[PDB]
Design a protein around this motif. Structure first.
Motif, PDB file in Angstrom:
ATOM      1  N   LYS A   1      11.348   7.296  -3.711  1.00  0.00           N
ATOM      2  CA  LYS A   1      12.538   6.809  -4.454  1.00  0.00           C
ATOM      3  C   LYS A   1      13.648   7.667  -4.593  1.00  0.00           C
ATOM      4  O   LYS A   1      13.355   8.890  -4.750  1.00  0.00           O
ATOM      5  CB  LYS A   1      12.168   6.366  -6.111  1.00  0.00           C
ATOM      6  CG  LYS A   1      10.317   5.928  -5.883  1.00  0.00           C
ATOM      7  CD  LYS A   1       9.519   6.527  -7.083  1.00  0.00           C
ATOM      8  CE  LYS A   1       9.680   5.614  -8.094  1.00  0.00           C
ATOM      9  NZ  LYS A   1       9.596   4.270  -7.842  1.00  0.00           N
TER      10      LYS A   1
ATOM     11  N   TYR B   1      16.050  -1.924  -7.329  1.00  0.00           N
ATOM     12  CA  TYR B   1      15.728  -2.492  -8.764  1.00  0.00           C
ATOM     13  C   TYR B   1      16.824  -2.094  -9.598  1.00  0.00           C
ATOM     14  O   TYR B   1      17.291  -0.988  -9.687  1.00  0.00           O
ATOM     15  CB  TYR B   1      14.579  -1.981  -9.281  1.00  0.00           C
ATOM     16  CG  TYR B   1      13.171  -1.926  -8.480  1.00  0.00           C
ATOM     17  CD1 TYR B   1      13.066  -0.920  -7.552  1.00  0.00           C
ATOM     18  CD2 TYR B   1      12.212  -2.737  -8.941  1.00  0.00           C
ATOM     19  CE1 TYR B   1      11.952  -1.223  -6.665  1.00  0.00           C
ATOM     20  CE2 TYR B   1      11.109  -2.680  -7.891  1.00  0.00           C
ATOM     21  CZ  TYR B   1      10.976  -2.024  -6.969  1.00  0.00           C
ATOM     22  OH  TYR B   1       9.583  -1.920  -6.240  1.00  0.00           O
TER      23      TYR B   1
ATOM     24  N   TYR C   1       0.789  -0.965  -0.241  1.00  0.00           N
ATOM     25  CA  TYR C   1      -0.064   0.106  -0.002  1.00  0.00           C
ATOM     26  C   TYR C   1       0.778   1.357  -0.076  1.00  0.00           C
ATOM     27  O   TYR C   1       0.910   2.038   0.966  1.00  0.00           O
ATOM     28  CB  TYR C   1      -0.857   0.093   1.190  1.00  0.00           C
ATOM     29  CG  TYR C   1      -1.723   1.227   1.526  1.00  0.00           C
ATOM     30  CD1 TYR C   1      -1.440   1.963   2.597  1.00  0.00           C
ATOM     31  CD2 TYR C   1      -2.584   1.802   0.484  1.00  0.00           C
ATOM     32  CE1 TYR C   1      -2.044   2.993   2.816  1.00  0.00           C
ATOM     33  CE2 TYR C   1      -3.192   3.082   0.982  1.00  0.00           C
ATOM     34  CZ  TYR C   1      -2.912   3.769   1.967  1.00  0.00           C
ATOM     35  OH  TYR C   1      -3.542   4.968   2.285  1.00  0.00           O
ATOM     36  N   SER C   2       1.561   1.310  -1.036  1.00  0.00           N
ATOM     37  CA  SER C   2       2.652   2.465  -1.237  1.00  0.00           C
ATOM     38  C   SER C   2       2.279   3.551  -2.167  1.00  0.00           C
ATOM     39  O   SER C   2       2.497   3.646  -3.473  1.00  0.00           O
ATOM     40  CB  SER C   2       4.095   1.987  -1.515  1.00  0.00           C
ATOM     41  OG  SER C   2       5.070   2.850  -1.821  1.00  0.00           O
TER      42      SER C   2
END
Lengths: 90, 210, 205, 90
Positions: D47, D73, D41-42
């Motif tokens: 980032k 990532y 639930y972001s």
């Protein structure tokens, strides 16, 4: 605007050539070198690519005794600087 | 299948040039447009010779105006269109004119300018000498605005281009990293030897001092 | 409308897919699947998921699917989903992974097949035990018209350009570091040579 | 799954942390690192982007005594490798 300072020919072979340019202070992502018969249309000179760090390149497959055009173009992002060119005969 | 062969085409001019764009909206503006001049051959026959010019915008990636001319249809535009040139030297002179447009200040006596007039389905590009109320077309050319298909193909060509340039950059980055690792190792070697020599020199000095 | 600016990429890899079309015959080609989770620019609380099927060989090949949470509830009843909107990508990636790691010796033989019939395309991941075929997920993708393919190429060119500028900065940085190392090497050898000449001149006494 | 298979928290201060991964075998142009409190639930994880050359990263400004999920990532030009995720409290 003649992005490579000056160009010279160093090789001495019947089927190939070796060209040397000098390192401009501008940002250059790559160089493209075109070799084609003089007087030709120039839309059949078979371009090949050289890294922006390097200042030398070897051409191959040339016919001996033909007048070939050697041109160096340096490329930026979204742009290409003006080329400098020399011609040599085998 | 496709007429022109971009794969083995030669790029002779690729630089932004100041261009005046005129449309029926009447919103006359001066925008810097990117001109790419390409000499190549058709994939159908190696004897058919083509010159193509692309007018694009780095600001608007969907703005494209194209011109494609063969050697044969060159006679139609040699007469009735601009200065006398052969198909070979036409790129050179057009390039010189564009460069003059780039380095063009008002005080320049031959103030060369470039204008692209877009009317509906067609656009005409002309380079004009504009001093003491003269408007003299040195070069007048007709450009096709981009349909979704040709602009799509152009975008794809530029995307593959950028991918190749960036892969070359990655190779160069790995090489430079290797060179820097070798240089730092040689630096460590030199400093170690320098420390050893300073030790020997200080021992020699203390031995002589006694 | 989806906002790619604040979207997160969860899967972006080539996937083995068998594509069968009415105009051309059956072929297995490796296709690139990009799964994105993000929110709308109209409402930052509203959630949308987007999936893109492209080809690194054919840059004009594009098939897109974008689903809201509400019509995802509709597709939860339409395909028997038993998981929430949040974790659905996970199952999709797992299914795709099963296709990726799929060889003839695999008993489940998870496969991906996409058939395009003139405006409509359905992508299906299937379990193939003996001859029975059970599709774990069946999704409907609208193939790309030239306009949306054009917009996709423009966005992707902007991506490559930005990442490439970042790499160019890193390259300049490493080149500068290498120049600094060369200068320090020159300094070190200089002082080594001069202290050696001092060694021998003190040998002169 | 995770292309690096080697992500851990390595330095730790009440407001900051240091994460270190290992993904040098593949060609990696960049990494994206996401750090946020809640698991799933972001709609508010911050980032930040890191060059493929790096093997370390520092996060700062974190809330003391809170649970963070951190994911790394790795991206290529035409692909993205599978991510690796950790949970840590600081």
């Amino acid at each position: 605007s003649s992005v490579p300072t000056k160009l010279e020919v160093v090789a001495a072979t019947p089927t190939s050539l070796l060209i040397s340019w000098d390192a401009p202070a501008v940002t250059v992502v790559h160089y493209v070198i075109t070799y084609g018969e003089t007087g030709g249309y120039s839309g059949s000179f078979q371009k090949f690519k050289v890294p922006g760090s390097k200042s030398t390149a070897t051409i191959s497959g040339l016919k001996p005794g033909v007048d070939y055009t050697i041109t160096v173009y340096a490329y930026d992002w979204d742009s290409m600087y003006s080329p400098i060119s020399i011609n040599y005969r085998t | 299948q496709t007429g022109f062969d971009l794969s083995t085409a030669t790029t002779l001019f690729w630089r932004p040039v100041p261009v005046h764009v005129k449309q029926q909206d009447r919103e006359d503006v001066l925008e810097e447009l990117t001109f790419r001049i390409l000499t190549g051959v058709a994939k159908q026959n190696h004897n058919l010779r083509i010159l193509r010019i692309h007018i694009s915008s780095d600001s608007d990636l969907f703005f494209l105006h194209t011109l494609e001319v063969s050697e044969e249809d060159f006679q139609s535009l040699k007469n009735d269109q601009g200065i006398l040139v052969d198909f070979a030297s036409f790129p050179g002179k057009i390039i010189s004119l564009l460069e003059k447009c780039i380095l063009a200040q008002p005080g320049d006596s031959p103030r060369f300018q470039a204008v692209l007039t877009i009317r509906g389905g067609e656009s005409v590009f002309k380079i004009v000498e504009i001093n003491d109320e003269k408007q003299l077309p040195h070069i007048t050319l007709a450009f096709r605005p981009g349909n979704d298909s040709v602009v799509k193909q152009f975008l794809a060509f530029r995307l593959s281009e950028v991918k190749g340039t960036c892969h070359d950059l990655s190779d160069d980055l790995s090489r430079t990293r290797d060179d820097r690792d070798s240089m730092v190792a040689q630096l460590a070697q030199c400093r170690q030897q320098l420390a050893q020599l300073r030790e020997q020199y200080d021992k020699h000095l203390l031995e002589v001092q006694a």
